[PDB]
Design a protein around this ligand. Structure first.
Ligand SMILES: Cc1cc([C@@H]2CN(C(=O)c3ccc(F)c(Cl)c3)CC(F)(F)C2)n2ncnc2n1
Ligand SMILES: [Mg+2]
Ligand SMILES: [Zn+2]
Length: 342
């Protein structure tokens, strides 16, 4: 059994120091997709140890090894929504902790919940969005369509199922109230990964950033948790252009596969999921300007040590406009043929 021997080494060999993963591992310029996937469950353990969550919460090391592997194996392999997405979303969360002094804004448990939520937040993604679940009358829609945030409810429920698999409940020693609190946090944080929820609360995040964050305001804690989670989720866009170019290819590969399925069901896909209508520079610039850039500008307004992130997102947004001409075929295709016109 494969998870068996991976669990054995991950448990008995010990936790590698975070600096022995990469000497810039804790830096905003690091690209965690560079880490071989075979190294990521150990990196997860290193970060959890480096943030002192293992010690502070007395996590059982056998239980935690089993947890991290179950979570890794709970992801499928679509182009974007796979375990390396969840790993790099988790890594950004760690970066926020190492760079933004989160302990002056959030309780220890909420910071713990964010990280765990990041590992869990796309569990069992099938490469399709919420509209498709309803359109295709999928089992998930039959469970959750009346509540909304179908996939994100499924992600949460998958995280609970992992917690309810014997030997995997890293929380099962918590006080009854702390346990309820952590699962409640995880619900709130995963559900915030629905961009429809982010977009619903944007004015409140705006309003919170303008008056200033009130450490004593419980609703500010929730709002801030949702913004940090979204910032982890879109964090691919805060790295160099090449990362974002590769990530754009993964996303559009995923969307266009969904759009192909929708056409094979008689539905006109969204322009962004239809490979015969999607103009990728247009869409990316729209996504960066209307969604990506405002999230990091809000992150910057709350944490000034986060300016570099927003400036990265803005740089990448402007590189899309620069390379947009390259989607126009000049001269002949490199094979010298115009057969593609027929
Ligand atoms: C890090 C990152 C993440 C996402 C997406 C954004 N998402 C959307 O629904 C979406 C909404 C409006 C858009 F204009 C587009 Cl293009 C997509 C949800 C998702 F697919 F899960 C991840 N993108 N998309 C393009 N570059 C991205 N970079
Ligand atoms: Mg998601
Ligand atoms: Zn995600």
């Amino acid at each position: 059994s494969a998870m068996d021997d991976e669990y054995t080494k991950l448990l008995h060999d010990g936790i590698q120091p975070v600096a022995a993963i990469d000497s810039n591992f804790a830096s905003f310029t690091y690209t965690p997709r560079s880490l071989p996937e075979d190294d990521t469950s150990m990196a997860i353990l290193s970060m959890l140890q480096d943030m002192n969550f293992i010690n502070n919460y007395k996590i059982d090391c056998p239980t935690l090894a089993r947890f991290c592997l179950m979570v890794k194996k709970g992801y499928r392999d679509p182009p974007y929504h796979n375990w390396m997405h969840a790993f790099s979303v988790s890594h950004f969360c760690y970066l926020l902790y190492k760079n933004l002094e989160l302990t002056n804004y959030l309780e220890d448990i909420e910071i713990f919940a964010l990280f765990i939520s990041c590992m869990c937040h796309d569990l069992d993604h099938r490469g399709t969005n919420n509209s498709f679940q309803v359109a295709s009358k999928s089992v998930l829609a039959a469970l959750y369509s009346s509540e909304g945030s179908v996939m994100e409810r499924h992600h949460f429920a998958q995280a609970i199922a992992i917690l309810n698999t014997h030997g995997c409940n890293i929380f099962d020693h918590f006080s009854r109230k702390d346990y309820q609190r952590m699962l409640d946090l995880m619900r709130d944080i995963i559900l915030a990964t629905d961009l429809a929820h982010h977009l619903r609360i944007f004015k409140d995040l705006q309003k919170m950033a303008e008056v200033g964050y009130d450490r004593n305001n419980k609703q500010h804690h929730r709002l801030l948790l949702c913004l940090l989670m979204t910032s982890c989720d879109l964090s691919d866009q805060t790295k160099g252009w090449k990362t974002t170019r590769k990530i754009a290819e993964l996303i559009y590969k995923e969307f266009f596969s969904q759009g192909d399925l929708e056409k094979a069901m008689g539905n006109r896909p969204m322009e962004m999921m239809d490979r015969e209508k999607a103009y990728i520079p247009e869409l990316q610039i729209s996504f960066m300007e209307h969604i990506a850039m405002p999230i990091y500008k809000l992150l910057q307004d709350l944490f000034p040590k986060a300016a570099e992130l927003y400036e990265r997102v803005a740089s990448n947004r402007e590189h899309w406009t620069k390379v947009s001409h390259k989607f126009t075929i000049r001269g002949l295709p490199s094979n010298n043929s115009l057969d593609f016109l027929d």
